[PDB]
Structure 1
Amino acid sequence: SDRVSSDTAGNTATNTQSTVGRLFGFGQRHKGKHPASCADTATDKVLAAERYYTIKLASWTKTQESFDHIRVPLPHALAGENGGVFSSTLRRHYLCKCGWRIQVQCNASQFHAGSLLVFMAPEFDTSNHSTEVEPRADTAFKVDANWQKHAQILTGHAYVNTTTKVNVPLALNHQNFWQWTTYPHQILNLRTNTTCDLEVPYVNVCPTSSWTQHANWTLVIAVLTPLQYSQGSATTIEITASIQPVKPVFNGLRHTVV
């Protein structure tokens, strides 16, 4: 009952009956102040853009191992048509600045076992690691379609051919997942909770973002404990997410992209 929580955002509302609270990364919220690096008065407080956008993320099966994960580049994950007015406004602006409030959903039963780590990370590598090809605009910022394995990111992944890889011991896109818990996060333990609630402020190398070139935040869902269940229990276990851009700011109005 203290675990029943409702959250309104524009014309949308998330509801959960097993919340463990909302974690505020860095104990900060994006307040929506205009970037001091822009002279043009920003476009803001667009109610049609300050809502939750819900999307399906993945299917969790017994084959996923600890640290296999799924990445959701932001704001790009919502820069497509399904991003509604946030997207259509974003595409027509040079710069955007915002925070994120997110809830990832995933229910099992009292007879299933397993757990996920739900976290937000700034400057978290979202490029593909199954190839030695340089990441490009249309491949670097895409939501993972398949679970990513973990071994090849511990020391990073150089965009060089397999034989050169031998003489490259470390790449700057390395991610020591044993410490992924140092990022603002929550754990989705099947026996405890079917939802995780996070919120992070705006962080970047600069006042506002030229988003077309940079996915500054990444929502990541990684399994910590493999999914387990006995013969007879529901086999389809899926993961979903409600993503809300917090008080976004737009500057530099222009014609649309693509």
Structure 2
Amino acid sequence: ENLSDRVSQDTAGNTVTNTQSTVGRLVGYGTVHDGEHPASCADTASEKILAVERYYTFKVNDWTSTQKPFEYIRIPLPHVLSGEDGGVFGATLRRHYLVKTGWRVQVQCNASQFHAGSLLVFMAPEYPTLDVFAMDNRWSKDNLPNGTRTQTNRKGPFAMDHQNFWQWTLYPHQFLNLRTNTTVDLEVPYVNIAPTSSWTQHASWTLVIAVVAPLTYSTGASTSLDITASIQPVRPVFNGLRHEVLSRQ
């Protein structure tokens, strides 16, 4: 079973995550979101809402024997938490024009000492997601590695949404290797083209889950491994208060 300097807890409001097999928290770019006000806004921000700075936990998908290498699932931020599952975060988010935040994630998946396989979990700024910024529905190897080009663009070399997955480890990441761990912990600071974001039309960060070494096991072993995640906005700062977005969807 799981041990000692590998047993770890993280308290967020009224939220706390525990793992008995961690490998540490990878802090991307080596910095955390400071929670500082955007220098481009004259209005004072609403910040430090306790009800907002906690972990939102929901399920991603199911890992099976069938997934092939590099098939993935994307979770666009802040969008995934802008709805009902986003609690007061979502509610506040829908009434502000702009949000500036960092992310702290934990993705979870257990198997046994008789299972073999590994996931790659990474977080990437400006990763190409669905149009509508929603979590992918099923695993896909869609539009890797040359991007999506137009129908007719018969001879085009590639499109700007290219993604050479052979290099996905350039992104802040950690491996969820079944023989080693059960959880992966990442944290990223705020990065964007501007001092704060009009989140409505931009999913600036994407949490990506990909298979790199396919699931293997002998008969009688657990057969499908669920994948869940805990996401927490790190010191979000809101500005430009107005009426509700509404069609939140």
Say if 2:124 is the partner of 1:142. no
Mapped to 2, the partners of 1:64 and 1:165 lie a distance apart of 30
How far did residue 249 of structure 1 move? 0.6
How far did residue 153 of structure 1 move? 1.9
Mapped to 1, the partners of 2:178 and 2:83 lie a distance apart of 31
Q: Is the 8 A contact 2:65 2:223 kept in 1?
A: no
Q: Partner amino acid for 2:12?
A: A
> Tell me, which stretches of 5 or more residues in structure 1 are unaligned?
128-134
Q: What's 1:88 paired with?
A: 91
Residue pairs, 1:1-258, within 5 angstroms: 1-127=4-130, 135=131, 140-149=132-141, 152-158=143-149, 160-161=150-151, 164-257=152-245, 258=247
How far did residue 236 of structure 1 move? 2.3
Mapped to 2, the partners of 1:243 and 1:55 lie a distance apart of 9
Q: Partner amino acid for 2:24?
A: G
Mapped to 2, the partners of 1:102 and 1:15 lie a distance apart of 13
**TM-score normalised by length of structure 1:** 0.93
Mapped to 2, the partners of 1:153 and 1:66 lie a distance apart of 12
Q: Partner amino acid for 1:117?
A: L
Matched position secondary structure for 1:98 = strand
Q: Partner amino acid for 1:106?
A: C
Mapped to 2, the partners of 1:112 and 1:166 lie a distance apart of 43
Q: What's 1:132 paired with?
A: none
Matched position secondary structure for 1:146 = coil
How far did residue 98 of structure 1 move? 0.2
How far did residue 148 of structure 1 move? 1.4
How far did residue 166 of structure 1 move? 1.8
Q: Is the 8 A contact 1:153 1:173 kept in 2?
A: no
Q: Is the 8 A contact 2:117 2:216 kept in 1?
A: yes
Deviates more, 1:50-59 or 1:230-239: 230-239
How far did residue 65 of structure 1 move? 0.8
Q: Deviations over 1:183-236 (max 9, x none)?
A: 000000000000000000000000000000100000000011000111111112
Q: Deviations over 1:72-91 (max 9, x none)?
A: 00000101101000000000
Matched position secondary structure for 1:85 = helix
How far did residue 169 of structure 1 move? 2.0
Mapped to 1, the partners of 2:23 and 2:219 lie a distance apart of 30
Q: Is the 8 A contact 2:145 2:162 kept in 1?
A: yes
Q: Is the 8 A contact 1:73 1:219 kept in 2?
A: yes
Deviates more, 1:165-174 or 1:22-31: 165-174
Mapped to 1, the partners of 2:5 and 2:153 lie a distance apart of 52
Q: Deviations over 1:34-75 (max 9, x none)?
A: 000000000000000000000100100111011000000000
Q: Is the 8 A contact 2:12 2:54 kept in 1?
A: yes
Mapped to 2, the partners of 1:153 and 1:170 lie a distance apart of 10
Q: Partner amino acid for 1:61?
A: T
How far did residue 168 of structure 1 move? 2.2
